Each structure stands twice: as structure tokens, then as C-alpha cells.
Design a protein around this ligand. Sequence first.
Ligand code: 0O2
Length: 286
Amino acid sequence: LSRTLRNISGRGRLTEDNVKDTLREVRMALLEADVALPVVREFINRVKEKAVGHEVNKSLTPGQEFVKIVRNELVAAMGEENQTLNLAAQPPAVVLMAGLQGAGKTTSVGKLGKFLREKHKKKVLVVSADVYRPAAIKQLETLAEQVGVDFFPSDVGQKPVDIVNAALKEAKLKFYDVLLVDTAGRLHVDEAMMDEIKQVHASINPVETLFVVDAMTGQDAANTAKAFNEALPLTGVVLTKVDGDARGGAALSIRHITGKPIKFLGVGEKTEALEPFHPDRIASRI
Ligand SMILES: Nc1nc2c(ncn2[C@@H]2O[C@H](COP(=O)(O)OP(=O)(O)OP(=O)(O)O)[C@@H](OP(=O)(O)OP(=O)(O)O)[C@H]2O)c(=O)[nH]1
């Protein structure tokens, strides 16, 4: 894939124009076909501009220089460096989970609770404002018991905004380092549901607003991301179901469309299947 052609120009000191055109065509084709990405035109142009600017042929290792340009533009396209959760402000840190139904929001709250307790030694509250989907509040409660985080009780009778305000009060009164807020989603982008997410965000003033999206959705993930970024000040993105996306380019798309970093990757169904996103790692893998 992107590996194979990039290997063929790993150590070729000639870099003839046909060799550049052939390498660029397959990277264009693999980005376009291997995944649902349509902004490849911008990536190829930047790689072409840098190659002319840095005079790759002048270098002792022109193919290595050309691949270095491709990797560096890939790392930049994916966010340059890992950005962590916004936990250096004043406790409690409020993290709002936003996204469509089926993206993986409830599972990700459990994943983040495990990650925050085991790695950052933090006290964590989880609350669910999903009074619309059936059994969802119990689903968070069960996940909280599995990951060792505390749960704030919620009921279908309550209205989402009231639930979040009450949990924030517990988080401040009991000195919780982190409050994780799970929210209801719809399966397509819905304005009414987008209006209620706005009121919940306004009430709790979240330090972190995380957009959870399914990589398997492909191009639709970027469109969903733009709509959420437009109506919410997204601080980060969580890409789920990576373990089941053979294509693998929802990542590059989202950072381009939103300008917001991917902070975490969901790589499975279990609570430990969370991995922090490192653009320089992932870029080297492919
Ligand atoms: N392969 C994979 N699937 C994921 C991942 N994250 C979430 N899922 C799927 O999402 C389901 C649970 O998360 P959801 O409750 O649906 O997420 P949301 O609906 O957006 O939040 P919400 O409940 O509305 O608050 C899981 O079902 P199950 O846990 O029953 O397992 P299985 O994969 O076999 O089905 C998974 O199907 C991931 O990282 N990798």
C-alpha cells in the first residue's frame, strides 16, 4: 500500500520525473481508494512543492528526502504531535462527549475512566444524559463499576441540562479531578439534538468537548465532524472502531475538515481498547 511504493523510492538517488509521477499517482490512488479521502489534491501539491523547494536530487539521498517529505506532510496532516486531555486547568475538569448514536460514546467514557484512573491517578465521575435511548444510563453504570470510576445517578424523568448541573455540583463538592458527561445522540445529524447539546455545554462550560465518531463511516465521519465543529467548540476527537476499518483514513480527513486533533483511538470493544493518538507513530506505520 502506501508502504510498498514509498519503499521503492526509499534509497533511489536518481528521482527521475516519471518516478515522482508514478509514486504520486499510487499515493493519490491509495489515499483516494484505500480510504474515502477527497482532499488528496492538497497533500500531493504540498509534497510536490516541498520536493522542488528542497531540491531533493541535490541531496545525497533524494528518495529518502522525498519519503521524508511525504511522512512530514502526513504527520502535519494528522496533528503533528499527541495532544493530551485538558487536565492542567482547575479541577473539576468537565469532559463532554458528543457525537452520533453508534459512534461509541458510552464505551469511550468507560475507556477514558480507566485511562484516567490507572494512568493519571485521578478521581472520576461519570454521568449519563441519555434519557432517550433505552438502558443507556445502566450501561454507563455497569461500565463505571468495571473501570473503577464513580457514577452519578440519572433517571429518564430528569431533563438532560438538570442532570449535568447536579453532577457538576457533586464534582466540585467532593473535589473530583474529572467529570465525564455522556450524552444522547441521533443516528443522523439532527438540529434539535444539536440544540440540546449546546445548552448542556453552556450549563457546564466543559474544559474538554470530545467528538466521538466511527471510522467505519468513512467520508460521512468528516461531514459529521464539520457539523459538530460548526455548532460546538470541539477541543478534540475520538476515532472509534479503528480495529474494524480496513481503509484507515478517517483520521486524516477529520483533522483537515475540523482543524481539531484526534486525541484518542478506540481499537476495540473492551475497556482497555483505548490508545492515545500519536501522529508521528501512525505516520510511520503506514
Ligand atoms: N470493534 C469496535 N467496536 C466499538 C468500539 N467502540 C464502540 N464500539 C461499538 O459501540 C457499541 C457500544 O458503544 P455505544 O453505546 O453504541 O456508543 P454510543 O451509542 O455512541 O453511546 P450512547 O450509548 O448512545 O451513549 C459496542 O457494542 P458492543 O460493546 O456490545 O460490542 P460489538 O462491537 O460486538 O457490538 C461496539 O459495537 C471500538 O473501539 N471497536
